[PDB]
Amino acid sequence: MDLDTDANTIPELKERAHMLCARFLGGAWKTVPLEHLRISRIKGGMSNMLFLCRLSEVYPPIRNEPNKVLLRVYFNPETESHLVAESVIFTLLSERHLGPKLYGIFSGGRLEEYIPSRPLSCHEISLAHMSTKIAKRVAKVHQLEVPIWKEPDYLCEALQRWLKQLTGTVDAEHRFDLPEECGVSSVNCLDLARELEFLRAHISLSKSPVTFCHNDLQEGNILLPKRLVLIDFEYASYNYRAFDFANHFIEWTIDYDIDEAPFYKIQTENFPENDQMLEFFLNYLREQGNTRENELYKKSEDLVQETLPFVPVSHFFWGVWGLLQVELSPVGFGFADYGRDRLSLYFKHKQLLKNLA
Amino acid sequence: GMKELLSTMDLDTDANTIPELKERAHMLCARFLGGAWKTVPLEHLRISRIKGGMSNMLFLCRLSEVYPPIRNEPNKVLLRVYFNPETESHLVAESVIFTLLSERHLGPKLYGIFSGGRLEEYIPSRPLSCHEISLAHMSTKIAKRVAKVHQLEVPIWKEPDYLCEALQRWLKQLTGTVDAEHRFDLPEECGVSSVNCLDLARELEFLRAHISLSKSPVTFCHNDLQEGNILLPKRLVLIDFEYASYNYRAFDFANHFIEWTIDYDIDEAPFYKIQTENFPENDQMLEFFLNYLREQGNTRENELYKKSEDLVQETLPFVPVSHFFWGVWGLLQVELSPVGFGFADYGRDRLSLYFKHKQLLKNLA
Ligand SMILES: [Ca+2]
Ligand SMILES: [Ca+2]
């Protein structure tokens, strides 16, 4: 397939979708003829391929089943803990009406309610009025009590398995070249392992309070329904709240609406200014309601320092992720270049993490 | 690991005297509950074995009055350990189911799910006895709770593939655990003197081919409606949806009715007693359905009796289905469970009951 391929014209894809919908939704989805099942590719983040499935007006729902559903397909290797956590999270958000209704979870994907809306652009999340809203939404996510592992082991656990799998997809003599401008011209899997050990040893020294985190607060997951809503908690877990902040601030510099390969553009100069990170925290702390008005500013200042160490953490995380997606994802995205760019940014800001020592 | 440690324990063991058990429990509570559970000295962490069904070992973990909750964490939690081989589809279904029951306050609050078990709110109560579920006033209440479970809309696989999918996996593992020439002897009075895993493989295909012919409406089912999972809180509640899934509603009924005949409160080995004579009479199954159908609210009062009759016929074919299911389950538990139960005898007994009533299933053809 490709960016403009008509999903409906791919029989094998249509059948798999027909099967998934029938099995998880029942009712009209079970007997609807293939020609009366419409499938449309929907635009979304590089982590997944989205397909809007819908029943023609000729075969409307016969009960409480929806007439259209969103099929999300991912390419991240699944683990026991991940399957359990994701199921708990998705069901809880669904049950509390904090996200689209969940319809089903399967190996490598899920079916959920389709919400008419539009995501924010990279530029929009830098706008004061939007950033303010995001801050308040994030404050709420961080207050959620979710029945899953409470220690911030997610980052390292995920990376360790991803690196392990990566190490098994390339020859030992293989090396990934990086733009010298970062300080390191190339790295192999053994180096990545050593860097991961450094990351693990230092983030554990962080005093950033641990909370339930989204972990992928890029613009693509911040929607305006047709009031902002955060969705797709695919990477969600308990984690240092600083990671969610640092990761989000970094997203201000990564634009995904690029039509030319590698299909993304990084403008480090767009990273929020200190004052901008501070305004964000003022809104976040104010929303959580545990900080007196006369203490908000200094608490926000502290939050900024707490966040910086995780800037390189975010870069390493998605850097290794990007490199692994190369051999696993069918998404039309420059994963090879993306992983190398994020990794170079990791080395560029590695000292911010080292400072925790 | 945890399984190896539990196999060294018995019914007369004081959980508090097993340090490794306290350490594992301490880690789990710390990791899923946080707060005081993170720093409570082991001496102030109390653990008591709680009586439960043969599918799991239960331990009530509690913080002494010296180290009370510092936040919103509970002062006590129930640790449940299971010994069923896990699968991707099961890990997901169970997580969705437990989270959904918790969120809707239809069961004990969920605190966490790990490999081979989970942590959930402890409910002061007592379970029903085998004899009690045969009582009219109790049977009526159970019927009403089941009607509600069957009305639940759960975001998991809607087709009734659970029974065969689980059995296929269990049978496969059992096959890999026993000698190729190994045969399980069965009481001759059932019509079959013995079987090996190859035969069971054939039986499963037979079962699969016939149940798919049933017109029994498919609904979310508990699948293990034995007295041990029917509690009276200190109003009956149904808990432990460990085996829950969409399934022919008839399986839930048939399996429950069969439970009237199996008593687990037996002090001598194999630690259970079966009295087929205690199986509900036709009119008793009818009364159960009268209540169940009335509770669902989709049946006119003047059609209850007749619809109930249809439910009895719909249910009978699943009697041998339940027997086969738990029979194979029983045989596999022999090698996986540390629980003090005669699984070998249990598997053989249920299996013989399968062959004894196999015709009821064949009839669907
Ligand atoms: Ca971005
Ligand atoms: Ca029983």
From Swiss-Prot, chain B:
Q: Which domain of life is it from?
A: Eukaryota
Tell me what effect the entry lists for E242 to N/Q.
Moderate decrease in catalytic efficiency
Instruction: Note the Pfam families from the entry.
Output: Choline_kinase (PF01633)
Residues binding Ca(2+) are: E227, E259, I262
* Mitochondrion listed as a keyword: no
Keyword DNA repair set for record: no
Cofactor requirements of the protein: Mg(2+)
Protein name, entry field: Choline kinase A2
Question: Which species does the entry assign this protein to?
Answer: Caenorhabditis elegans
